[PDB]
Amino acid sequence: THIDYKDTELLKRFISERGKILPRRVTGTSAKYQRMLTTAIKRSRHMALLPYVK
Amino acid sequence: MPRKGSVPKRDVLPDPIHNSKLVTKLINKIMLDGKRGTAQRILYSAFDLVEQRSGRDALEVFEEAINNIMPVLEVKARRVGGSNYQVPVEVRPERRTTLGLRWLVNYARLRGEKTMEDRLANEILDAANNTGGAVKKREDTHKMAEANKAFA
Amino acid sequence: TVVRKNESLEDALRRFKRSVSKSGTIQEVRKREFYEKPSVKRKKKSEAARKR
Amino acid sequence: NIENGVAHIRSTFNNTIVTITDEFGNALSWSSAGALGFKGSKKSTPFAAQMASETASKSAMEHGLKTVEVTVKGPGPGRESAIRALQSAGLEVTAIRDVTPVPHNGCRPPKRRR
RNA sequence: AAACUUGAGUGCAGAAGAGGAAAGUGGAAUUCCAUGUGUAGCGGUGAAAUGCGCAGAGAUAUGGAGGAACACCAGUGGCGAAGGCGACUUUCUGGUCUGUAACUGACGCUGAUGUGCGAAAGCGUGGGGAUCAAACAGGAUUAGAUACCCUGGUAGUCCACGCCGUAAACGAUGAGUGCUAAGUGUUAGGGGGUUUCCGCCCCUUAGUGCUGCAGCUAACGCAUUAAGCACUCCGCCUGGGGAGUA
C-alpha cells in the first residue's frame, strides 16, 4: 500500500508525544515503509494536520 | 591496617566513682605525659566544685555540659581543586563522643586561674549553662559548616 | 508539557524527570554546546550506533 | 490578579534566574542568585535555587498570586531544585513544563573550547 | 566472404533513491529593532575581569524585519564517476538495479595527447551580511606569550557570474572480465512454498558491512567488495637528503 498524507489517525500513532518522529527501532516498521511514512508525515506538518512541537 | 579495612577498636574500663566510661576517657585526655594519678586526682577535685556550685551530682552535670560542646556538623575536605573543597559532613557517633571531650579540655587550659582544680570546673559549668569558650567554638563550627551549605 | 495534579510535588517530579529524559532537550543542547566539525559528528553518530 | 500566574525559571550553566508573572505574562516579580550575594560561580548550585525561588515568590505581594504552574526554560544544575524549593513557599505547583528553545538545526553554534 | 548467440546495446514490464538544476512554500531557533509589564544586576570563568545596564539591561509577552541552516525521522542506511548530496512542493533532466525474453548481431575493453567536472581556503565584478569568525583590540592565567581562556570584532562564511584546479582528493589499493570453503547482518527487487489475517521460511540477482578456510604477504593483515589464481590496457617507482627546489 501507500501512506496517504490525509489519513491522520494511522499517521499520528507514529508521531511522538511531543511531535517528533518515532524511529523504526522503537516502532518496528520496515525500511521502505518508514521513509514512505516520513514523506507523508512532513507534508502533514506543512498543512497543519500535525504540529512540529506540541 | 587502614587500607586492608578498618582497625578493630578496643574496650576501655569505666570509672569506679561515677561508674562511667565517659569519666575515664576524660581522665586519659587530661593525662598529660603519662601521669595517671596526678591527673586523676585533679578531676576528682574538679567535680566537687561542680557539686558545690550546683546541688546536682556531677555525673548528670557532665553529660549535660558536653551536649553544648558536641557539634552535629563539621567539615571534611574533599580534593576538588578549584571548588570550595569544604563539604559539610555530619559526625559519626564515636567522633561525636571524642571531639566534645577535646574542646572541653583544650579551652580549659587557657583561663585566668592556674590550678586545674578550677580551670576545668569553670568551663564545665559554662558548658552546663550553654556559655563560655568551649561552647562558642561549636557555634563557630555552626557558622562555618552551616554557611557553606551548598555541598550537602 | 504534562499536567500532574492530585498528588504532592515530590511525585510530580518523578513524572517530570522521566518526561524530560525521554525527550530531545538535554541530550540535544549538550550536543549544541559548541560547533563540531561536519565530518566528526558522522563518526560521533557512528560510535553512538555501533555500540547501540 | 489574585492566585493566577505563570512561573518562569531558566537555570543556565550559571546563575539560576526566576521571574514569576501572571497568566498573560507581565513580570510580577523576579529574583536571581546574584541578587542574594552570590557573586560568581556559586550561582551554579542547587543551593542557590533553594533561596532564589521563594524570594521572588513571597516578595510579590501586589496581588496575592499564589499559584504558579511553573515553566522550565534552561539546562542547569538547579533545575528541579527550584521547583522543590517553590513548595517551601507552598504555592500549589500544578503544571510543570519544559519549554526550552530547541533549534531545528537553524544557526551555527560557537567554536569548540580547548 | 558468410553463420551464431552468451558479451555489449535497445525494447517491453516493474521498482528504489539526501543524483543534479531552476522556481516556489514552510516551521523552530539566533541576532537586531519597536512596544507592554517589571527591577538591580546581567554576562562570563579553575577563579575573576574587560564588556553591558537606572537614557530601564537582562527576564517575560505580543508583533515586526532580515540572513543562515533544516532538529526528530537518521541507520557500519540510500544515491553519484569522484568532489559530494539531508525541510517540503512543482517543473526540467541524468544514471543504476530486477524480471521477461521480442529484437540488433562483437557493435567490445582499455585509453597516451586532448577535452570537461573537481571539498575547502583563496581571487575578480557586483549583491547580501543573521550566527560564527582569521587579522586586530582589551581583560585574565603563567615562570614567561604572539598560545590556551573571556569580551568585542573585519575579510570571509551566503547568493549570482567568471576564475583558480589544488587536499591524509584515502579503501593511503587504476579500469575491465572470468574463476576459487563457508557463516552472518542489512538495502533494492524477483520466483517459490505455506499461508500470514501483510508475518515468516527456502532459492536466486545486484548493492552494502562484519567474521573466516585455501591461497597470498616481509610482517601486520587481505580473503567472491582479494592484497588469491589468470589475461588485456593505462598511470607510475627504482637509495636518503639536495627538492617537488634552480
XYZ file of C-alpha atoms (C1' of nucleotides) in Angstrom:
618
model
C 0.000 0.000 0.000
C 0.926 3.699 0.134
C 0.501 6.129 3.022
C -1.801 8.992 2.121
C -0.966 12.194 3.963
C -4.579 12.955 4.940
C -5.146 9.678 6.846
C -4.223 11.282 10.145
C -5.208 8.584 12.665
C -2.843 5.909 11.358
C -0.257 8.651 10.811
C -0.398 10.127 14.335
C 0.299 6.857 16.132
C 3.768 7.265 14.581
C 4.260 10.836 15.794
C 5.789 11.299 19.226
C 4.224 12.527 22.466
C 5.621 15.974 21.596
C 5.548 15.951 17.778
C 8.817 14.158 16.929
C 9.178 11.005 14.824
C 9.472 7.600 16.417
C 12.359 5.667 14.850
C 11.644 2.296 13.285
C 13.836 0.819 16.031
C 11.101 1.504 18.595
C 8.063 1.280 16.288
C 9.103 -1.820 14.357
C 8.180 -0.962 10.772
C 10.233 -1.919 7.734
C 12.746 0.229 5.865
C 10.751 1.374 2.835
C 7.635 1.835 4.948
C 9.456 4.259 7.268
C 10.678 6.555 4.500
C 7.386 6.395 2.631
C 5.935 7.359 6.007
C 8.320 10.253 6.535
C 7.477 11.996 3.266
C 3.819 11.846 4.335
C 4.334 12.907 7.955
C 6.141 16.044 6.725
C 3.548 17.045 4.154
C 1.061 16.774 7.028
C 3.225 19.008 9.205
C 3.090 21.622 6.450
C -0.714 21.715 6.208
C -1.241 21.774 9.988
C -2.780 18.323 10.331
C 0.076 17.576 12.754
C 2.251 20.004 14.732
C 6.000 20.457 14.722
C 6.140 20.558 18.523
C 3.246 20.482 20.964
C 45.750 -1.592 58.664
C 43.826 1.463 57.423
C 43.595 0.189 53.835
C 43.021 -3.531 54.375
C 39.791 -2.438 56.070
C 39.109 -0.901 59.475
C 41.122 -1.205 62.683
C 39.425 -3.206 65.478
C 38.552 -0.655 68.148
C 39.273 -1.705 71.718
C 37.414 -1.635 75.021
C 38.043 0.727 77.931
C 37.454 0.339 81.675
C 34.780 2.511 83.356
C 35.435 4.705 86.374
C 34.946 3.345 89.914
C 33.497 6.519 91.461
C 30.911 7.663 88.910
C 30.625 4.158 87.360
C 31.024 5.769 83.951
C 33.081 5.075 80.846
C 32.918 8.778 79.966
C 34.787 9.827 83.119
C 37.757 7.517 82.433
C 38.008 8.804 78.861
C 38.209 12.303 80.341
C 40.982 11.048 82.660
C 43.007 9.769 79.707
C 42.763 13.024 77.763
C 43.766 15.231 80.710
C 46.577 12.755 81.416
C 49.467 14.924 80.256
C 52.704 12.938 79.814
C 51.529 9.552 81.093
C 50.902 10.683 84.693
C 47.736 8.805 85.634
C 47.469 9.617 89.332
C 48.453 13.287 89.254
C 45.775 13.957 86.608
C 43.022 11.738 88.039
C 43.314 13.482 91.424
C 42.634 16.810 89.708
C 39.455 15.540 88.018
C 38.356 14.084 91.370
C 38.856 17.636 92.714
C 37.280 19.294 89.652
C 33.779 17.894 90.087
C 33.459 18.662 93.802
C 33.417 22.362 92.899
C 30.837 21.380 90.278
C 28.782 19.740 93.029
C 29.475 22.782 95.238
C 28.244 25.401 92.740
C 25.258 23.213 91.791
C 23.303 20.838 94.009
C 23.102 18.081 91.397
C 25.652 15.283 91.273
C 28.241 15.862 88.579
C 27.652 12.664 86.575
C 24.383 14.259 85.495
C 26.151 17.603 85.022
C 28.988 16.143 82.894
C 26.749 14.549 80.262
C 24.584 17.691 80.361
C 27.575 20.001 79.822
C 29.084 18.081 76.895
C 25.847 18.307 74.891
C 26.574 22.031 74.478
C 30.056 21.022 73.266
C 29.379 18.155 70.822
C 28.543 19.550 67.349
C 26.334 17.902 64.739
C 28.026 19.139 61.543
C 31.713 19.509 60.694
C 33.899 19.987 57.614
C 35.778 17.228 55.796
C 37.916 18.497 52.920
C 37.430 16.774 49.561
C 40.141 17.443 46.968
C 38.009 19.016 44.248
C 40.701 21.536 43.303
C 39.119 24.799 42.182
C 35.891 24.227 44.127
C 35.291 25.178 47.765
C 36.814 21.818 48.877
C 34.902 22.024 52.191
C 31.991 19.577 52.424
C 29.686 19.872 55.473
C 29.624 16.310 56.833
C 27.737 15.027 59.873
C 29.627 13.377 62.714
C 29.910 9.652 63.411
C 28.885 8.693 66.991
C 32.418 7.695 68.027
C 33.868 11.010 66.835
C 30.784 12.670 68.354
C 31.900 11.459 71.787
C 35.608 12.216 71.342
C 35.507 15.710 69.823
C 33.395 17.058 72.681
C 35.991 15.831 75.182
C 38.699 17.508 73.086
C 37.189 21.007 73.151
C 36.323 20.718 76.856
C 39.977 20.281 77.859
C 41.773 22.353 75.200
C 39.994 25.548 76.291
C 40.129 24.660 79.982
C 43.895 25.223 79.684
C 43.513 28.892 78.649
C 41.771 30.542 81.607
C 42.818 33.067 84.237
C 43.282 30.755 87.218
C 46.325 28.474 87.167
C 45.089 25.387 89.011
C 43.094 22.846 87.023
C 41.346 22.400 90.350
C 39.170 25.211 88.954
C 40.370 25.651 85.355
C 38.304 22.598 84.441
C 35.228 23.096 86.635
C 34.629 26.684 85.478
C 34.346 25.621 81.831
C 32.082 22.697 82.793
C 29.527 24.980 84.467
C 29.841 27.282 81.463
C 29.098 24.281 79.248
C 26.361 23.284 81.692
C 24.875 26.768 81.220
C 25.492 26.767 77.422
C 28.133 29.516 77.532
C 31.874 30.046 77.899
C 34.629 29.334 75.392
C 34.284 25.662 74.508
C 30.615 26.216 73.661
C 31.259 29.259 71.468
C 33.527 27.423 69.034
C 30.804 24.842 68.444
C 28.744 27.789 67.208
C 31.815 28.858 65.206
C 31.701 25.467 63.507
C 27.941 26.021 63.211
C 28.612 29.349 61.485
C 31.229 27.851 59.128
C 29.825 24.466 58.070
C 26.318 25.987 58.102
C 27.425 28.888 55.884
C 28.814 26.702 53.085
C 25.704 24.534 52.830
C 25.993 24.137 49.043
C 27.667 20.721 49.460
C 25.127 18.667 51.416
C 4.061 19.802 28.880
C 2.277 17.259 31.077
C -0.038 18.415 33.866
C 0.356 16.476 37.126
C -2.110 17.052 39.965
C -3.996 15.212 42.752
C -0.662 14.389 44.436
C 2.342 16.046 46.079
C 5.247 17.819 44.369
C 7.804 15.082 45.117
C 5.807 12.705 42.881
C 5.112 15.120 40.019
C 8.902 15.456 39.774
C 9.202 11.685 39.260
C 6.904 12.001 36.250
C 8.725 15.102 35.017
C 12.256 13.725 35.461
C 11.466 10.883 33.038
C 9.263 13.013 30.758
C 12.400 15.055 30.037
C 14.872 12.157 29.802
C 12.549 10.676 27.159
C 12.824 13.841 25.072
C 15.353 15.580 22.874
C 16.104 18.504 25.186
C 19.021 17.655 27.486
C 20.822 15.393 25.009
C 20.163 17.992 22.288
C 21.502 21.120 23.998
C 24.543 19.227 25.311
C 25.274 18.367 21.679
C 24.971 22.023 20.634
C 27.215 23.490 23.317
C 29.899 24.012 20.659
C 30.128 23.641 16.899
C 31.506 20.279 15.890
C 33.183 19.717 12.557
C 30.865 18.463 9.754
C 32.738 15.132 9.476
C 33.350 14.391 13.172
C 29.634 14.120 14.002
C 29.321 11.440 11.320
C 31.806 9.435 13.399
C 30.205 10.585 16.665
C 26.876 9.240 15.407
C 28.717 6.123 14.203
C 30.139 5.486 17.678
C 26.670 6.127 19.153
C 25.253 3.456 16.793
C 27.899 0.716 16.629
C 27.710 0.432 20.425
C 23.865 0.685 20.396
C -4.943 39.078 39.535
C -5.198 37.027 42.729
C -3.987 33.393 42.555
C -3.334 33.001 38.820
C 0.039 33.138 37.147
C 2.964 31.661 35.246
C 6.307 30.937 36.900
C 9.340 31.128 34.603
C 12.689 29.633 35.580
C 15.665 29.264 33.254
C 18.671 27.804 35.047
C 21.591 28.002 32.633
C 25.065 26.638 33.408
C 25.407 29.757 35.594
C 23.061 31.974 37.593
C 19.619 30.414 38.045
C 17.119 33.175 37.225
C 13.404 33.135 38.105
C 10.629 35.546 37.081
C 7.066 34.921 38.207
C 4.323 36.584 36.181
C 0.589 36.381 35.515
C -1.085 34.001 33.058
C -0.748 36.629 30.289
C 2.895 37.393 31.088
C 3.584 40.809 32.621
C 6.542 40.202 35.024
C 5.003 40.365 38.501
C 8.288 39.830 40.363
C 11.734 38.379 39.764
C 14.874 37.402 41.637
C 18.225 35.827 40.859
C 21.226 34.238 42.526
C 23.217 37.445 42.057
C 20.526 39.314 44.000
C 21.330 37.166 47.072
C 25.028 37.977 47.442
C 26.292 35.091 45.302
C 28.960 36.974 43.359
C 30.249 34.365 40.917
C 30.389 30.579 40.283
C 28.443 29.825 43.473
C 25.338 30.676 41.445
C 25.553 27.363 39.539
C 24.358 25.352 42.542
C 21.014 23.824 43.539
C 21.512 25.550 46.902
C 21.330 28.886 45.074
C 17.921 27.789 43.772
C 16.901 26.920 47.348
C 16.617 30.630 48.203
C 16.203 32.415 44.858
C 12.815 30.852 44.055
C 10.733 31.943 47.046
C 12.407 35.347 47.467
C 10.636 36.452 44.289
C 7.504 34.436 45.047
C 6.990 35.576 48.637
C 8.123 39.104 47.776
C 5.455 39.501 45.102
C 2.776 40.870 47.464
C 0.943 43.014 44.885
C -1.997 40.719 44.113
C -1.607 37.507 46.119
C -0.776 35.452 43.031
C -0.344 32.182 44.902
C -0.497 29.602 42.107
C 2.403 29.259 39.686
C 2.245 26.319 37.166
C 5.986 26.658 36.586
C 7.844 26.687 33.237
C 11.399 25.369 32.764
C 13.499 27.076 30.083
C 17.115 26.116 30.717
C 19.656 23.298 31.100
C 21.096 23.813 34.557
C 22.111 22.132 37.812
C 19.458 23.869 39.907
C 16.630 22.911 37.564
C 14.432 20.634 39.687
C 15.748 22.168 42.926
C 13.986 25.453 42.115
C 10.524 23.848 41.992
C 11.238 21.655 45.005
C 12.117 24.875 46.848
C 8.975 26.518 45.454
C 6.798 24.374 47.736
C 8.862 25.758 50.592
C 6.838 28.846 49.735
C 3.945 26.444 49.090
C 2.233 27.845 46.000
C 0.442 24.731 44.556
C 2.673 23.840 41.605
C 0.147 22.270 39.243
C 1.614 22.159 35.699
C 5.351 21.715 35.106
C 6.543 22.349 31.546
C 9.996 22.002 29.994
C 9.618 24.736 27.383
C 13.233 25.071 26.301
C 14.423 26.524 22.967
C 15.499 23.608 20.775
C 16.520 24.574 17.220
C 15.614 22.730 14.049
C 19.325 22.967 13.112
C 18.996 26.663 12.396
C 22.157 28.617 13.201
C 25.875 27.978 13.588
C 26.866 27.420 17.248
C 30.185 28.858 18.529
C 33.628 27.236 18.432
C 34.779 24.217 20.420
C 36.568 25.051 23.668
C 40.127 23.773 24.071
C 33.185 -13.627 -47.756
C 29.183 -15.875 -44.510
C 26.683 -18.062 -39.844
C 25.663 -17.684 -34.473
C 24.241 -16.009 -29.552
C 26.136 -15.695 -24.172
C 29.469 -10.215 -24.243
C 27.528 -5.164 -25.367
C 23.184 -2.246 -26.544
C 17.877 -1.290 -27.462
C 12.660 -2.982 -26.444
C 8.575 -4.422 -23.023
C 7.061 -4.622 -17.695
C 8.268 -3.327 -12.622
C 10.830 -0.751 -8.827
C 14.229 2.223 -5.232
C 16.949 6.817 -4.403
C 19.820 13.463 0.543
C 21.681 12.149 -8.281
C 21.729 17.171 -10.317
C 19.354 22.230 -11.999
C 15.608 26.189 -11.524
C 11.335 28.368 -9.173
C 8.064 28.465 -5.062
C 6.305 27.231 0.181
C 7.051 26.287 5.491
C 8.363 25.818 10.921
C 11.683 26.009 15.379
C 15.968 28.723 16.846
C 19.853 33.058 16.588
C 20.511 38.434 16.094
C 18.556 43.423 15.770
C 14.504 46.938 16.291
C 9.554 48.792 18.134
C 6.099 48.181 22.402
C 3.684 46.462 27.056
C 4.597 45.000 32.109
C 8.546 44.934 35.577
C 13.596 45.766 38.914
C 19.022 45.579 40.074
C 22.233 43.374 38.209
C 23.202 40.581 33.632
C 27.065 38.002 31.272
C 31.404 35.037 31.855
C 35.368 31.651 34.217
C 39.670 26.918 37.503
C 38.795 31.718 39.910
C 37.902 36.854 38.130
C 37.949 40.993 34.931
C 37.216 43.597 30.272
C 32.057 44.287 28.283
C 26.503 45.572 29.099
C 22.642 48.107 32.414
C 18.945 53.278 36.101
C 18.965 57.476 28.751
C 15.202 50.790 32.181
C 19.596 45.928 30.894
C 18.620 41.040 31.360
C 14.000 38.127 32.406
C 8.795 37.892 30.337
C 4.691 38.571 26.457
C 2.954 40.110 21.583
C 4.213 41.918 16.783
C 7.933 43.115 13.015
C 12.324 42.887 9.843
C 16.417 40.038 7.934
C 20.026 36.378 6.899
C 21.591 31.422 7.518
C 20.681 26.342 8.148
C 16.981 22.253 8.013
C 16.037 19.101 14.928
C 13.041 14.373 15.105
C 12.992 10.661 11.014
C 18.830 9.250 10.683
C 20.935 3.528 10.189
C 28.759 0.185 9.511
C 21.426 3.140 5.506
C 20.458 5.409 0.152
C 22.269 7.791 -4.392
C 26.695 9.721 -7.662
C 32.365 8.727 -11.755
C 34.799 11.463 -7.968
C 34.254 16.063 -5.188
C 29.824 15.178 -2.867
C 24.384 15.074 -1.670
C 19.611 15.858 4.392
C 12.814 20.764 5.312
C 8.731 20.494 1.696
C 6.297 21.049 -3.292
C 6.150 21.536 -8.704
C 8.604 21.634 -13.453
C 13.052 20.036 -16.390
C 16.739 16.102 -16.538
C 20.842 12.074 -15.761
C 22.173 7.059 -14.002
C 21.666 2.205 -11.686
C 19.014 -2.413 -10.364
C 15.248 -6.538 -11.182
C 12.278 -9.535 -14.490
C 10.816 -11.036 -19.404
C 12.680 -12.783 -23.441
C 10.859 -9.691 -28.669
C 14.964 -7.503 -31.428
C 20.414 -5.707 -33.404
C 24.333 -9.308 -34.267
C 31.048 -8.417 -31.492
C 28.510 -3.301 -32.311
C 33.535 -4.866 -27.067
C 37.509 -3.409 -23.268
C 41.447 -0.083 -22.073
C 42.775 4.621 -23.346
C 48.733 8.493 -24.403
C 47.854 13.713 -26.430
C 43.311 16.114 -25.797
C 38.683 17.832 -23.608
C 35.369 18.540 -19.198
C 33.878 18.028 -13.680
C 36.665 18.728 -9.096
C 35.980 19.856 -0.950
C 37.703 23.959 1.490
C 40.675 28.382 1.609
C 41.600 31.984 -1.988
C 40.967 35.996 -6.336
C 37.710 39.259 -9.644
C 32.981 42.089 -10.629
C 28.632 43.163 -8.008
C 24.993 41.769 -4.012
C 23.785 40.475 0.843
C 25.501 40.492 5.827
C 21.950 36.576 10.905
C 25.212 33.463 13.601
C 30.102 32.138 13.519
C 34.917 34.082 12.881
C 41.388 34.521 10.798
C 43.709 39.514 11.342
C 43.013 43.051 15.147
C 41.631 45.446 20.337
C 41.097 44.711 25.538
C 40.787 41.682 30.323
C 42.922 37.330 32.978
C 46.237 32.977 33.509
C 51.614 31.620 33.634
C 57.739 31.241 35.250
C 57.289 33.553 30.502
C 53.343 34.738 25.237
C 52.081 36.359 19.785
C 49.357 30.323 22.624
C 45.284 28.239 25.666
C 40.522 31.052 28.308
C 36.935 35.509 28.121
C 34.507 40.181 25.952
C 34.281 42.614 21.279
C 35.258 42.355 16.082
C 36.934 42.924 9.835
C 37.817 39.995 5.449
C 35.473 35.535 4.972
C 31.307 32.181 5.835
C 25.902 33.099 1.985
C 23.989 34.290 -3.326
C 24.946 35.494 -8.980
C 28.756 35.280 -12.867
C 33.776 34.363 -14.325
C 38.394 32.313 -12.358
C 41.843 29.294 -9.583
C 42.420 23.169 -10.163
C 44.986 22.108 -5.628
C 43.708 18.148 -0.101
C 45.726 12.375 4.609
C 41.021 14.410 -3.072
C 42.318 7.864 1.364
C 39.583 1.693 0.670
C 46.973 5.520 1.578
C 44.695 -0.222 -3.049
C 43.680 2.089 -11.783
C 39.986 0.056 -15.076
C 37.685 -4.467 -17.414
C 36.263 -9.796 -17.424
C 36.473 -14.739 -15.615
C 37.463 -18.334 -11.837
C 38.067 -20.184 -6.322
C 35.318 -23.074 1.537
C 31.544 -21.265 4.113
C 28.901 -18.490 8.154
C 26.326 -13.872 9.097
C 23.725 -8.664 9.326
C 21.326 -5.205 6.016
C 19.340 -2.413 1.312
C 16.655 -2.703 -3.705
C 13.914 -6.356 -6.455
C 12.178 -11.351 -8.422
C 10.281 -16.602 -8.251
C 8.537 -20.188 -4.771
C 6.354 -22.616 -0.504
C 2.969 -22.396 3.364
C -0.429 -19.001 4.377
C 0.037 -14.575 7.409
C -5.445 -12.141 8.514
C 0.819 -8.205 5.265
C 4.081 -12.394 9.151
C 7.829 -15.891 8.233
C 10.815 -19.901 5.650
C 13.941 -21.638 1.453
C 16.317 -20.374 -3.510
C 18.293 -16.565 -6.797
C 20.064 -11.259 -8.615
C 22.569 -6.502 -7.601
C 24.458 -3.390 -3.530
C 26.480 -2.659 1.337
C 29.068 -4.402 6.094
C 31.185 -7.967 9.928
C 33.654 -12.853 10.759
C 36.858 -16.806 8.391
C 39.487 -21.573 5.090
C 42.530 -22.432 0.768
C 45.958 -19.242 -1.232
C 48.935 -14.927 -0.527
C 52.188 -11.356 2.495
C 58.423 -9.174 4.963
C 55.119 -8.986 8.996
C 50.507 -6.746 10.312
C 46.871 -8.418 7.698
C 43.832 -9.462 2.931
C 40.389 -13.124 1.974
C 33.692 -13.867 -4.017
C 33.598 -5.882 -2.243
C 41.391 -10.109 -2.613
C 46.151 -7.605 -1.164
C 44.084 -15.429 -4.067
C 44.560 -17.632 -9.247
C 44.787 -15.509 -14.553
C 44.591 -12.365 -19.280
C 44.304 -7.245 -21.681
C 45.423 -1.998 -21.441
C 46.845 2.584 -18.893
C 49.433 5.620 -14.911
C 53.917 5.183 -12.093
C 58.631 3.598 -8.922
C 63.843 2.012 -8.827
C 68.910 4.632 -2.055
C 68.115 9.287 1.673
C 68.838 14.422 1.579
C 69.619 18.485 -2.019
C 63.722 19.195 -3.811
C 58.610 18.898 -5.975
C 63.661 23.391 -5.230
C 67.096 26.144 -9.842
